[PDB]
């Protein structure tokens, strides 16, 4: 009903997806949804009991046979097939998890977001977790210095991200940023993004990235590979890939007219959204 244009975009402090929100969210049982690390839903050494095992200091032993709504996130880890016998209990109205790859209706994808910022005693985390900064240059004057940026580690996942390096590094409507993880460096990082209509997107270790994320909290587009993960999010502004091949000035600027020209469910990039999704339950 209320959906907007990407450029009307407005963010409060406390609007931006985390996965620690959500993870915090269930603590208060009355909500009536367990969180559990995927890592512990992947090597269950039971059918259907799963432990976070001291994860968060929680040691609950979780009886999935009796879990009413299941949450699955901190982890690369993806719910697929191997999950079969877990999404089959009929007392599991719903599974939200991070990295989807399972065309399963009980299986309900919520986005990465933002890095952990309060992930304990991790100096990476506090810094690229820095929600603030987000806020900040968002209400900065959006100039656009060029048509997309490039600021990805390839090794993360090369048969994608090598591609993109070696097709396009060389473009005049390319601007490539170096990788630098200072607080400095994620202030620039930021910034330059917000200076780019599009950003490649593409998939890490882990399908769901945080640069998508980051990307549509600064209103640019951020160019993704098609994925089975990425499915219950074509009602936001993704530009969705067949593959990394043949992307041309033309192309975006057609893809730029026609995206900033829709209207999208924008109340899916606030935490309030996932917050009233699971209370449905
Ligand atoms: O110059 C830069 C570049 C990147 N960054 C930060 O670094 C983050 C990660 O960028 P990288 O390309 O190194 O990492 P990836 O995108 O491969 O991995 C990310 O998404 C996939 C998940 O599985 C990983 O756990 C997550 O780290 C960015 O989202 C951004 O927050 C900066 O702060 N400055
Ligand atoms: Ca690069
Ligand atoms: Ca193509
Ligand atoms: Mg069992
Ligand atoms: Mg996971
Ligand atoms: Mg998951
Ligand atoms: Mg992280
Ligand atoms: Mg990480
Ligand atoms: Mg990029
Ligand atoms: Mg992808
Ligand atoms: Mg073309």
């Known amino acids: 009903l209320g959906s907007m244009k990407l450029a009307e975009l407005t963010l409060e402090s406390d609007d931006f997806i985390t996965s620690d929100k959500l993870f915090n969210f269930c603590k208060s049982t009355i909500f009536g949804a367990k969180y559990v690390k995927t890592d512990f839903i992947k090597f269950r050494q039971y059918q259907y009991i799963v432990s976070n095992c001291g994860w968060r200091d929680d040691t609950d032993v979780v009886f999935l046979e009796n879990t009413p709504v299941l949450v699955t996130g901190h982890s690369d880890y993806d719910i697929s097939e191997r999950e079969i016998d877990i999404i089959r209990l009929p007392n599991i109205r719903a599974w939200f998890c991070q990295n989807r790859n399972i065309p399963h209706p009980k299986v309900i994808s919520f986005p990465l977001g933002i890095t952990n910022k309060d992930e304990p005693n991790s100096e990476i985390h506090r810094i690229i977790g820095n929600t603030d900064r987000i806020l900040e240059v968002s209400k900065t004057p959006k100039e656009i210095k060029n048509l997309v940026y490039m600021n990805i580690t390839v090794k993360n996942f090369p048969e994608e991200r090598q591609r993109i390096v070696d097709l396009y590094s060389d473009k005049s409507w390319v601007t490539i940023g170096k990788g630098e993880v200072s607080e400095e460096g994620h202030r620039k990082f930021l910034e330059d993004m917000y200076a780019h ?39 936001l502004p993704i530009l969705f890939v067949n593959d990394w091949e043949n992307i041309t000035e033309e192309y975006l600027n057609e893809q730029y007219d026609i995206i900033m020209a829709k209207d999208w469910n924008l109340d899916k990039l606030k935490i309030d959204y996932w917050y009233q999704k699971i209370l449905e339950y």
């Open 197 to 235: 209509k599009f950003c490649f997107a593409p998939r890490g270790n882990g399908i769901d990235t945080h640069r998508l994320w980051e990307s549509l909290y600064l209103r640019t587009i951020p160019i993704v590979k098609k994925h089975i993960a990425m499915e219950q999010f074509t009602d």
